[PDB]
Amino acid sequence: DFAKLAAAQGDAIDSRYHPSAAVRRQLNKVFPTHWSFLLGEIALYSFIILLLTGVWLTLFFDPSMAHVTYDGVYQPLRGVQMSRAYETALDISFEVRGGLFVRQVHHWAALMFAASIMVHLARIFFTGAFRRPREANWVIGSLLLILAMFEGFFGYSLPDDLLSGTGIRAALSGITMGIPVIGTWMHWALFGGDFPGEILIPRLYALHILLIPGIILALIGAHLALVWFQKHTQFPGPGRTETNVVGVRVMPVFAVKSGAFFAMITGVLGLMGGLLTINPIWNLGPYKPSQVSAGSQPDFYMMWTDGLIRLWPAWEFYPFGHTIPQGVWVAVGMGLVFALLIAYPFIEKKVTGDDAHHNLLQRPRDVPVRTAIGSMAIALYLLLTFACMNDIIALKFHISLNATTWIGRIGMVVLPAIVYFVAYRWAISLQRSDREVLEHGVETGIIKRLPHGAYVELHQPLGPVDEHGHPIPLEYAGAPLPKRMNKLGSGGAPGTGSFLFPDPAVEHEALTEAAHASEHKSLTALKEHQDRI
Amino acid sequence: WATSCPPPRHNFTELPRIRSERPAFELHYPHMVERMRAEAHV
Amino acid sequence: NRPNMVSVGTIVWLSSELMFFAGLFAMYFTARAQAGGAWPPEPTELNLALAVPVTLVLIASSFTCQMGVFAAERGDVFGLRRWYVITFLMGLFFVLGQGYEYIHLVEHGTTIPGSAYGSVFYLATGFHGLHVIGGLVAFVLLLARTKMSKFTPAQATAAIVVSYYWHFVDIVWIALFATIYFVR
Amino acid sequence: VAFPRLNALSFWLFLFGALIAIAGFITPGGAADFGWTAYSPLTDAIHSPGAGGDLWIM
Amino acid sequence: VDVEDVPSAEWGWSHMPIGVMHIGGLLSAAFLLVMMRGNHVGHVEDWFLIGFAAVIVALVGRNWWLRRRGWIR
Amino acid sequence: QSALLRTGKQLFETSCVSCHGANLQGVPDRGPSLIGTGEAAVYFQVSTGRMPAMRGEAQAPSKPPHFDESQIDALGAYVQANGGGPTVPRDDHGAVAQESLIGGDVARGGDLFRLNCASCHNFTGKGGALSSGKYAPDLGDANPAQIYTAMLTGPQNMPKFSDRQLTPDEKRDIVAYVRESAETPSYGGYGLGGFGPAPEGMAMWIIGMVAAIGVAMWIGSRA
Amino acid sequence: PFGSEGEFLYSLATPLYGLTFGLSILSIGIGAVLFQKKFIPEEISVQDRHD
Amino acid sequence: MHIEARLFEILTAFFALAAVVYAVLTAMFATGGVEWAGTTALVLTTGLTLITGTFFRFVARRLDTRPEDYEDAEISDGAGELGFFAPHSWWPILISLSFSTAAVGAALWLPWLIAAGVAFVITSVCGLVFEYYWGPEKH
Amino acid sequence: ADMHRVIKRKGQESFNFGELFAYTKVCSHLGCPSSLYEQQTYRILCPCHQSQFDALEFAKPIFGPAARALAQLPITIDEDGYLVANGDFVEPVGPAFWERK
Ligand SMILES: CCCCCCCCCCCCCCCC(=O)OC[C@H]1O[C@H](O[C@@H]2[C@H](O)[C@@H](O)[C@H](O)[C@@H](O[C@H]3O[C@H](CO)[C@@H](O)[C@H](O)[C@@H]3O)[C@@H]2OP(=O)(O)OC[C@@H](COC(=O)CCCCCCCC[C@H](C)CCCCCCCC)OC(=O)CCCCCCCCCCCCCCC)[C@@H](O)[C@@H](O)[C@@H]1O
Ligand SMILES: CCCCCCCCCCCCCCCC(=O)OC[C@H]1O[C@H](O[C@@H]2[C@H](O)[C@@H](O)[C@H](O)[C@@H](O[C@H]3O[C@H](CO)[C@@H](O)[C@H](O)[C@@H]3O)[C@@H]2OP(=O)(O)OC[C@@H](COC(=O)CCCCCCCC[C@H](C)CCCCCCCC)OC(=O)CCCCCCCCCCCCCCC)[C@@H](O)[C@@H](O)[C@@H]1O
Ligand SMILES: CC(C)=CCC/C(C)=C/CC/C(C)=C/CC/C(C)=C/CC/C(C)=C\CC/C(C)=C/CC/C(C)=C/CC/C(C)=C/CC/C(C)=C/CC1=C(C)C(=O)c2ccccc2C1=O
């Protein structure tokens, strides 16, 4: 019945499309199981949730700048003039059952999408996963991050509330028009005239629901296809070489783990959507150029840019009756940052001279200069991000606002230098900590007094020993070293049973023996594969 | 003062016999131990 | 043939933590001497129909904790787990009973800002309740550790010192309960 | 010592508690100004409202 | 770098030229000094900028002198 | 009332003279003249505990009041007798008005608040930073009369809003908006302080991302 | 509206949506992770890159 | 370890005498009667030394002489394993950073920061307590 | 009492009607409403990027990313005593651009 049906459908599919060999190649593909290789798929799942909830939102949203009088249920805004966009954003959150939940899941998913992209980028950079043959795919990811930043910005600009409209007036309108020679032409091409105009929100809506997400989808497809057919990197370890992939096959283990991780990410984003308020636009009011509120932060992934605006000094030039205003610096700065991010693999292969194929990753401690540089970059990013929140920090943490500006200004130079130096020394220090275990074995923490009164700590050797009993020094192999005896199995196991009642002793004995035999067989399999290759 | 400068990680590669509150002094000047017991009281 | 080092450290720390409650008792007695005859003052109506059963549950948690200690000294990890789960449930019941008493006291106008009696009552009993919550966290952490490795003497020592802390909390509560609900 | 990790914790608690108390000086009002002995009621919220005093306490 | 200084020197990028750090320090100090040009009317921050620039110049100069004299490599 | 006037002077003499002068004229570089500030200024400054001030810095904070209601009335009467000025609105029984100050048009109040108030106090009266150590405070604790007199008297660096610039009915609409935006629950979960992007981005990093990475660590392997 | 009898229950609607949805798919994901970890065979596979 | 118990018992004798004397001398001819703060502090200082001294005295009468309690013990009497002493840990600084987070939260009265600091403290203390008890990862 | 501390801008010496001054509410840095008006310091604070303008010295920037003063509106009264504008701004209002001045 259920088996004959599967065989019949399988034969029908195979006689018509003969996919057996290609499907089997997909089922046998091996992926490494490292926890940090799951960071990219948080971004993928966030993007999928964004697509689903965004499609739901487009069924109710009218992105018009046409001014109307609010006639809905939210009493504190009755009679207030607003755009159709603000109108329908309110209608979603009050007049459609589940609309507020969908809207909040969309916005939380956008935040998790940007944050996931950042953390996954950090893994790629610090482990060296960008090196050849994978330079292009770092470039594709860099473009994906830029597109995600601007997509999220356009998305939260759509409701045309006071806060987001203030963000549009300063960043999208002010910086753009400040651009030299072509600034005002770019402004009038984008807005159709002066700010705010009547075309901006419908145009941003078209960019946000179709055009930018289509480019993102195409780039994500290229990205995942490159990963799939270039065969994911791995960390050094037992049995791992430059020419193999150690891990699990797709069918069934990796497929089950991916599906379960997708379900758990969805659960977290769903709990956030209905437990934490995000962007309650009815409290902000519709956008009016005469109004503003304290605390005009953008979403976090834009804050650094805003932070840069806050920190850069009022340096302007007035050549021959023209004006180059302060915001131009910020624009140039952004370009520079992006250009340095896209170009990093080629910069590093030019500096280091290393142009070899690489499939084995580097532990971040073992590349101290790149780790120091990335730590320096993260320090600058965090300083600019917190500079953007300097007014909130001043209010909550009792710091002068002027002082926060100057702390950001000086720290923008000093903090990355300090962080670079500290991260460099810390990475080399971890290298020395690994060396110590390699020469002496694992410190067990057990102190012993010898008969003549010496105090010695017992060590657990990781390899062969002498006739004197000291271990032979082992060579570093790019892989982590154990430093706790409990992580080597010294603690044993409690004893089989439920939490409150023991199982029969014979069951416990059989289970423990089977577990030890299985662990030994797995170690032996990896060892003999390593010995053979 | 009955160990090296600086001490090792676990402070002692050996200990002397402890028979008073001046064990390092008795370690370094054995000939004085008798005097130390004889002259202790005014 | 030698002292249990973790035991002596725990006892020494508990004796120090007695001085912390000394400060709060001093605050209570200073406010009581300045009462002027009305202690507790209106509208505070303490009720023993609920304080007494909560006190008795906390006292019985000491016997259940001692039973867990006997199991641990015997090497029986499962008996230790059962008795410490019972003790955790009883101390959690004490915390909830105290919270219910707090809620009924606040509705009738006994609060920290409201009166000097409310200030001393709530700092004394609330810091004791915080100590109880810390002890419940200690039970949770100890019980999770017994699932991590085999039951060694060090693990049993950890159980014993957690019980030392629980007995300290129970005895401090007996002293606080005597001075608040009977030496008014 | 009997408890090496507790010893390390004691040092780090010293360092960060001292930094918390001194950080009153980076607030606009400034650090505690009621003396090291902190006599009452000078230290109450009515007579020493600033954040410097609370940072000193914690 | 030698492996006595950086144990994993053959596993990754382990050496940054000293001229890069010396010049970067001097340029960072100069940038701190150029932010005295602005619209601000107070001088507390001018003293902070001067002090941080002085510390940076002193650190760069000490490092450069000790490398020249051979005391550090 | 002469008794109320002598009680106010008696209270003033051992609490306010060091900074404001025996004749309410001010002590230079220590405290301003109080002539013409009015009973409303006294009510706002003393009922929110800002007065008596304890030191000079960027901004004098609010704190627990040093006087009760009748003492506040006495001090306000004493100050009113020296120069007049605005007074605190009262109800039929002569109590300081609280409920009758809640206006009936909260949409107008919200529009007025966003034009006049949210620049310094934020979209929903959560507070905002000012220039150098100063700040517009969170509005969630002020009672209606405190809001009304705060607009009426222009405290510290808050602009002064006269009864001609903002009529009493406009002020009552504003106080209705301030009170209702303080007492309304959040609709989409925990309100996260009401500041928006900064605490939302903090919640993503410390809750959502920490959860996601912990789950990845649980599903994945090490080394 | 503000100060109405129904405002408190209304304020829990979206939180309850998120609690019941988020928990549900969260629990299914946990259960599937556990099934992989406890019942699907443990495996080590090696693929040649041919790159 | 009889000297260790004796030290605390001697302190206990002095503290108990001081507490009784102070309470009686302030009850009589002192304004207001018993001075409650100092009396309470002296009584519970007595209790502190009493708890520790009673514990030491009970321990002493159990175990016979240790090599550090023996006037002519040999160094070789102390041969063998002493116990476990943690070789390294970065969990103490994490615990202190967490507690300082909660303390800054309490100083500035930011309840969300207090909540975050308490959660950090619980996680860091779990990290310390489990550091030498986590088994190998399972796959 | 603060009128002796007012410094006039060239070309704008008569733009005030006694002790009433009118400046553009649009910030000259990037166009936000720069409307946090501190009456005692006479400081106009922009909430967006923390520019500060000196209201006594013709709204000249004294802190932040703003390099240019806020434009002053000339004001007067008519026969009925209502405040009216006494002409236009004498410079462009709002954020700067390549073509300006
Ligand atoms: C510690 C290590 C170093 C050595 C040991 C100790 C050194 C520190 C000693 C500093 C002493 C300062 C005075 C203390 C008293 C004080 O409290 O202040 C006084 C008053 O001052 C202000 O009034 C000014 C007048 O008195 C008023 O008459 C006037 O009216 C007012 O006018 C303003 O205002 C008006 C409107 O009101 C406008 O009309 C008008 O135009 C104007 O704007 C004035 O103000 P203004 O000039 O703004 O500020 C200036 C104040 C303000 O205080 C200050 O010193 C500012 C604080 C400076 C902090 C220094 C930072 C040090 C750098 C770091 C160490 C770098 C990192 C390194 C760390 C580790 C390194 C290891 C790796 O004096 C000074 O700077 C003093 C000058 C000297 C300062 C010292 C600099 C040393 C560093 C250089 C060398 C580098 C180091 C070497 C390296 C190898 C107002 O505030 C008043 O309220 C206030 O009362
Ligand atoms: C994967 C999972 C993801 C999901 C996570 C979900 C978690 C969130 C909870 C779920 C939501 C519940 C369902 C429906 C929502 C609900 O039913 O909600 C009720 C109301 O709730 C709030 O009302 C408070 C009062 O009830 C009102 O009376 C009052 O008016 C209101 O006042 C605001 O409004 C006024 C205007 O009038 C202003 O005057 C005023 O100032 C203020 O703004 C209040 O709000 P507020 O103070 O914000 O929160 C205070 C919170 C307390 O904090 C919180 O729990 C917030 C926690 C999340 C924040 C995370 C921040 C992370 C920080 C970083 C880690 C930083 C550190 C890193 C750097 C370190 C540096 C070192 C190097 O209350 C308390 O329980 C206090 C007691 C104890 C708190 C504990 C509760 C739970 C957690 C406990 C943690 C363990 C131990 C216990 C802790 C003490 C406001 O939202 C209201 O809208 C809302 O209506
Ligand atoms: C560029 C720039 C902005 C510069 C200013 C930087 C600066 C000086 C910041 C520090 C401010 C502080 C902490 C002031 C007091 C002084 C002080 C104690 C300083 C530190 C002293 C010190 C180094 C020693 C002690 C040890 C130590 C390291 C202390 C811990 C410090 C901690 C944990 C403080 C937090 C630091 C910080 C700036 C965090 C920002 C948090 C953010 C952005 C949260 C946003 C947010 C807010 C603001 C909410 O209102 C809210 C409401 C409801 C729910 C959630 C939130 C929420 O998350």
Ligand code: HEC
């Ligand atoms: C910035 C220039 C402000 C504007 C515009 C408004 N307010 Fe304000 N307010 C400001 C400050 C700096 C202060 C504190 C002053 C003090 O003397 O300490 C205040 C104070 C208030 C208060 C008192 C709040 C209390 O602590 O409970 C209220 C009720 C208040 N402000 C309300 C308010 C309203 C309704 C406004 C619009 C008309 C308004 N403020 C404008 C700063 C500024």
Ligand code: HEM
């Ligand atoms: C929308 C944003 C992105 C998504 C959804 C995404 C998704 C993924 C996924 C799932 C993987 C494979 C699994 C893994 O290693 O984690 C991956 C790999 C990769 N990503 Fe990303 N990525 C994004 C952005 C980026 C960024 C910003 C970079 C770096 C600039 C980057 C570079 C790479 C590289 C080089 C790999 C292959 C690494 C390897 O084999 O180990 N990606 N990406």
Ligand code: HEM
């Ligand atoms: C990379 C993917 C995306 C990101 C980062 C993103 C981000 C955002 C953000 C932050 C908002 C503001 C949400 C709010 O109201 O609070 C928003 C609004 C919106 N988005 Fe998206 N979005 C993405 C993809 C999509 C897609 C594919 C669609 C269309 C199917 C879509 C449709 C909408 C609509 C209609 C709104 C307006 C309605 C509203 O604000 O509630 N989004 N987006």
Ligand SMILES: CCCCCCCCCCCCCC(=O)O[C@H](COC(=O)CCCCCCCCCCC)COP(=O)(O)O
């Ligand atoms: C996807 C829709 C239908 C899914 C059913 C196909 C998979 C089961 C059929 C084969 C397995 C059982 C043995 C069997 O019937 O052997 C044969 C069927 O399988 C084949 O030979 C071709 C199968 C290839 C198609 C699979 C593509 C995608 C399927 C993946 C779904 C997870 C028939 O056995 P027989 O001829 O009797 O020896």
Ligand code: FES
């Ligand atoms: S818009 Fe005013 S400072 Fe930027």
